[PDB]
């Protein structure tokens, strides 16, 4: 790997610089290098990893949606034939997106998840696993779509089970996991009722535990609670 010659600490330093410069592809490449050093990641380092890839894949997903919409319009009655270019370019973006997802999943499988014993790290990585299978599901149309969806579901479910046993209902990782699994239910699994139930129960259980928190912890928990409320408002 091109980052094999760079010190772990230098990769982490450069990932932080890349974030400040909004150079998310670089940030991701640095963090991939850091993971491949083989040591476990700290909380801060896990956040760098997630932020980098979230931003890279987020841009790819937005581009894919633009292109997919153009392609769908091209296949409506009365649309003039314009050749294979729209499909080709959507496929190009799609393939690059799938590559990024496969890269992230690969890091999780080799060997972040298996070495993660503390609840906070394990849930964090399993949420990522669910998320990147969800992004694969968004673009899947073939024989494997069901298995991809199930892979996302299974990862999210393992994370939910650990989070419920080991973390308070206000923990931001637990909250963000539930937010995302709820979106999985609504957008991927065709289960809007399950999505709405999960978001509501998560919100209400967090509300009940806010009294235990410091001002700073309260800030983080309430921010995610508002995202839950925002989705509920969208869906009801």
């Amino acid at each position: 790997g091109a980052m094999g010659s760079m010190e772990r600490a230098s990769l982490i330093q450069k990932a932080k610089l890349a974030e400040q410069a909004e150079r998310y592809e670089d940030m991701a490449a640095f963090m991939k290098g850091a993971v491949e050093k083989g040591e476990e990641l700290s909380c801060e380092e896990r956040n760098l990893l997630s932020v980098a890839y979230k931003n890279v894949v987020g841009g790819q997903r937005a581009a894919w949606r633009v292109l997919s919409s153009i392609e769908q319009k091209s296949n409506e009655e009365g649309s003039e034939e314009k050749g294979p270019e729209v499909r080709e370019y959507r496929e190009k973006v799609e393939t690059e997106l799938q590559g990024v997802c496969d890269t992230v999943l690969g890091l999780l499988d080799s060997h972040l998840i298996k070495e993660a014993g503390d609840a906070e790290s394990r849930v964090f990585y399993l949420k990522m696993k669910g998320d990147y299978y969800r992004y694969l599901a968004e673009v899947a149309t073939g024989d494997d779509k069901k298995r991809i969806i199930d892979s996302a579901r299974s990862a999210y479910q393992e994370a939910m089970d650990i989070s419920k046993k080991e973390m308070p209902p206000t923990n931001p990782i637990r909250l963000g996991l539930a937010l995302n699994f709820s979106v999985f239910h609504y957008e991927i699994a065709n289960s809007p009722e399950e999505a709405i139930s999960l978001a509501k129960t998560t919100f209400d259980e967090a509300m009940a535990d806010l009294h235990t928190l410091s001002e700073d912890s309260y800030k983080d928990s309430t921010l995610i609670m508002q995202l839950l409320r925002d989705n509920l408002t969208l869906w009801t």
């Binding site: 963000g176 937010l179 995302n180 989705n231 869906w235």
Partner: peptide, 5 residues
């Protein structure tokens, strides 16, 4: 699109 984190 709905919110995720």
């Amino acid at each position: 699109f709905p919110a995720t984190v």
